[PDB]
């Protein structure tokens, strides 16, 4: 029933994600010199460095808010890819499966802790 425990659990999951080779295209903002049409397709850019900095600044109130931004990384890859067989999109699907498998207990424990508090 620790209402604060999610934050260190999200720090440790981001460290696992940074060690995975599948995260490399997603660690920093998409390079607009490499992809000059990116902002004609994608309204809200997001990357794992941005998510870690927001967490470390004390600018997430809950793990649900962190989860919305990580899901935006994956939806941006699905919207920008020219093919469902592309290399980088293929990497996004494996990393999304890994993230969802690990975030589920973080979300459940936080929501349970908050119900006990209230």
Instruction: Please report, as ranges, the residues that interact with ligand RYD according to CB under 6 A.
Output: 25, 30, 35, 77, 80-82, 86, 88-89
Task: Please give the Cα distance from 92 to 77 (Å, whole number).
Answer: 7
Task: Give the CB-nearest residue to ligand RYD.
Answer: 86
Q: Are 26 and 98 in contact (CB under 8 A)?
A: no
Least separation in angstroms between CB 27 and ligand RYD: 11
Least separation in angstroms between CB 75 and ligand RYD: 10
Report which of 63, 66, 69, 73 is spatially closest to residue 29, judged by C-alpha positions.
Answer: 73
The smaller minimum CB distance to ligand RYD, of residues 86 and 104, is found at 86
How many residues would you count in the chain? 118
The smaller minimum CB distance to ligand RYD, of residues 7 and 71, is found at 71
Report which of 49, 55, 54, 52 is spatially closest to residue 26, judged by C-alpha positions.
Answer: 49
CA 6 to chain centre: 15
Least separation in angstroms between CB 97 and ligand RYD: 16
The smaller minimum CB distance to ligand RYD, of residues 63 and 76, is found at 76
The smaller minimum CB distance to ligand RYD, of residues 54 and 81, is found at 81
């Amino acid at each position: 029933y620790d209402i604060q425990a999610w934050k260190k659990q999200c720090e440790e999951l981001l460290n696992l994600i940074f060690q995975c080779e599948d995260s490399e295209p997603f660690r920093q903002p998409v390079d607009l010199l490499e992809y000059p049409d990116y902002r004609d397709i994608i309204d809200t850019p997001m990357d794992f460095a941005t998510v870690r900095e927001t967490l470390e600044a004390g600018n997430y109130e809950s793990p649900m808010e962190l989860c919305k931004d990580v899901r935006l990384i994956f939806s941006n890859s699905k919207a920008y890819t020219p093919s469902k067989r592309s290399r980088i999109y293929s990497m996004s699907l494996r990393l999304s499966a890994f993230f969802e498998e690990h975030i589920s207990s973080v979300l459940s424990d936080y929501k349970s802790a908050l119900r006990f508090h209230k």
